[PDB]
Design a protein around this ligand. Structure first.
Ligand SMILES: [Co+2]
Ligand SMILES: [Co+2]
Ligand SMILES: [Co+2]
Ligand SMILES: [Co+2]
Ligand SMILES: [Co+2]
Ligand SMILES: [Co+2]
Ligand SMILES: [Co+2]
Ligand SMILES: [Co+2]
Lengths: 219, 173, 175, 175
DNA sequence: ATTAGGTTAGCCTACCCTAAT
DNA sequence: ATTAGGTTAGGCTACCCTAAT
């Protein structure tokens, strides 16, 4: 509980929502960042006042070009940090997202560029999330799981884990324990209502809300 | 202008002053952090209220054990970051201290430990400043932290000079 | 923007609110004196520290006896000044309230007493507001003090020769 | 102890010193206003920063035109207030100067003008001090410094003196 | 006067919250 | 999502002071 930089985490969140294909609403930000209704509405006002974003006629949040540009740089900083954190520092894979959620707000554009050099590929984050706006820096999609599951199960390759899932602890640690990592060969079914994955005989039942947050391949 | 974490930079500063052999005075913090007199005196009161430091009978700042502990952890995180930044990331040597001045406030204990591993020696910072409290972590002589900030006078030092009487007691050896 | 004496204007405000039958809340003072929330809450704390007022269990502001006394003395000084300003100096009637809003803070008790003498009746202010705590001094019915400040809406009231529809907020203003 | 408006009493004092023929020095303000040395040197710095006055090469204080202008307005307000206090309000003559020392900082230009009208002559203050800058308004004597010296002044009043041995310092006070 | 170090009153903003709508 | 009323942390200026230069 300390966004480090409120404005940034708000924009990164709208960004995220757009990524997951969800409609950016004050309500989303609220639940996602565990902040009171009044609170987020006001912090957003401030943002709008700084032409960072605008509350549409339909209550949806449209980042101004400038707000959008920043949101993107933060997401980029995040994934780049994650990569460094794991590839170079070798920090525990679970702690990786949290550390980054912090660093994203204090990493310079220079350091970023240096990273690009020092890092092998910078296509995606350790979780398969594509690193954006590498252009501003000046330097294929997988199927949501919720879409690939069936009555009869099938093996398939984990391709992407959304930033929103990385936050769902009990849910994330769980999968992380089934020793599921990007690239894992996993099994998936729509058994009586819910979707589940199984890597090492271990089964992880995805929250209906999260089923959408995991992109898949086809082996 | 954004300490990232006020309390931390205040403590790190008291620590720093102690390092340079200067008496920690609210006044110091003020000039060093370019903050109003009333401001630092207040922020410090807050600190004292949280048993992080106490204003001596002679107005000097004595970090409580706890305060001292944190102050140290910060300095440690700072220098470690610097090392990482230069040795691994290879970020320009002038920008290094600034970046670290930020990272020091968002670097976890683990990352620190991982660093010790991935880093060659962790005796001192790239500026020769001895990395402290590596024990609780569970694991020319030097240009003081205060000089690393003096851009103009430091780059004149890198161009290699006469140092301001104030920055005199800054470079040890 | 210069209360001249902050503490006084805060207490006079609580008094006023009481007059208008409104509940004295930090929020009131905030909007009325156009000061930030944290600000008034702090200045009020200072006040409470000086036993001038106490924030009730329900967040309402109860002036201590001593705070109350002062609040009153200020209201009195205010109305007395207004009377002198109009009756004797003959200063323009709109400017009267403002000038008084200043003088209330620098008028001695003596001057007050002298005014009592030099002035005809000292029952109410030029705007019909009853002048208070005269006992202690040792010597349309009315437009509340809050309305007197509402320049635009007040001059619209004066343009009607009143000694006009009023904003719902200014409703409970003219007794 | 409450200048009401610090900058004003500072400028009014420099003005006053000039009147008494004394050289305006930070030191004077300090003693006259019973304020610490560092305090006045700083407050004055502020003033200078606001082009209200400048500290001469010889440490003397030269009010800028603008500073001068205000200084004048204050003195004007002062004496005008005194006249009203005595002539109209009829407030005790000793208390008169003090009350005015306060009002000078909260009296508007209008009330001043109104005063000009309501008052007989506005040549000098009740103490014989010539009321200045009336021209700008758009419409022998006991120096201001003596009027403050209560003990020595009441000793002067006990002799029935209107516009004995005076302290060598208070000598250049009565013109 | 100035250096040195500190103090109170009086203000503001960015952020967070709960109760009640 | 808003209305209503607070909050803390962190920062600021104007103005006033004692002690030691
Ligand atoms: Co992440
Ligand atoms: Co974050
Ligand atoms: Co450093
Ligand atoms: Co820092
Ligand atoms: Co009035
Ligand atoms: Co007032
Ligand atoms: Co006089
Ligand atoms: Co005065």
């Amino acid at each position: 509980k300390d966004l480090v930089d409120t404005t940034e985490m708000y924009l990164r969140t709208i960004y995220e929502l757009e990524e997951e294909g969800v409609t950016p609403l004050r309500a989303r930000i609220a639940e996602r960042l565990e902040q009171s209704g009044p609170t987020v509405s006001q912090t957003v006002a401030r943002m709008e006042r700084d032409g960072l974003v605008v509350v549409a006629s339909d209550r949806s949040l449209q980042m101004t070009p400038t707000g959008r540009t920043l949101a993107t740089a933060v997401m980029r900083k995040h994934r780049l940090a994650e990569r460094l954190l794991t590839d170079i520092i070798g920090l525990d894979i679970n702690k990786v997202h949290d550390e980054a959620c912090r660093w994203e707000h204090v990493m310079s554009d220079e350091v970023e560029r240096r990273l690009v050099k020092v890092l092998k590929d910078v296509s995606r984050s350790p979780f398969g999330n594509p690193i954006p706006g590498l252009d501003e820096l000046g330097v294929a999609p997988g199927t949501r799981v919720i879409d690939a599951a069936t009555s009869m199960p099938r093996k398939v390759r984990i391709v992407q884990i959304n930033e929103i899932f990385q936050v769902e602890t009990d849910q994330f640690t769980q999968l992380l324990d089934a020793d599921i990592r990007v690239g894992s060969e996993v099994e998936i079914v729509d058994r009586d209502g819910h979707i589940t994955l199984s890597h090492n005989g271990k089964d992880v039942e995805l929250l209906d809300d999260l089923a959408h947050t995991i992109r898949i391949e086809e082996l | 202008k954004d300490l990232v974490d006020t309390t931390e930079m205040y403590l790190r500063t008291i620590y720093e002053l102690e390092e340079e052999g200067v008496t920690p005075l609210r006044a110091r913090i003020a000039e060093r952090l370019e903050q109003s007199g009333p401001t630092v005196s207040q922020t410090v009161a807050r600190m004292e209220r949280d048993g992080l430091v106490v204003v001596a009978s002679d107005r000097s700042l004595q970090m409580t054990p706890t305060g001292r502990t944190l102050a140290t952890a910060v300095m440690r995180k700072h220098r470690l970051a610097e090392r990482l930044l230069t040795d691994i990331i290879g970020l320009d040597i002038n920008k290094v201290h600034d970046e670290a001045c930020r990272w020091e406030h968002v670097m976890s204990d683990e990352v620190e430990r991982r660093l010790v591993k991935v880093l060659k020696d962790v005796s001192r910072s790239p500026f020769g400043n001895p990395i402290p409290g590596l024990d609780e972590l569970g694991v020319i002589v030097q240009i003081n932290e205060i000089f690393q900030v003096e851009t103009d006078q430091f780059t004149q030092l890198l161009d290699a000079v006469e140092l301001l009487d104030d920055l005199a007691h800054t470079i040890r050896i």
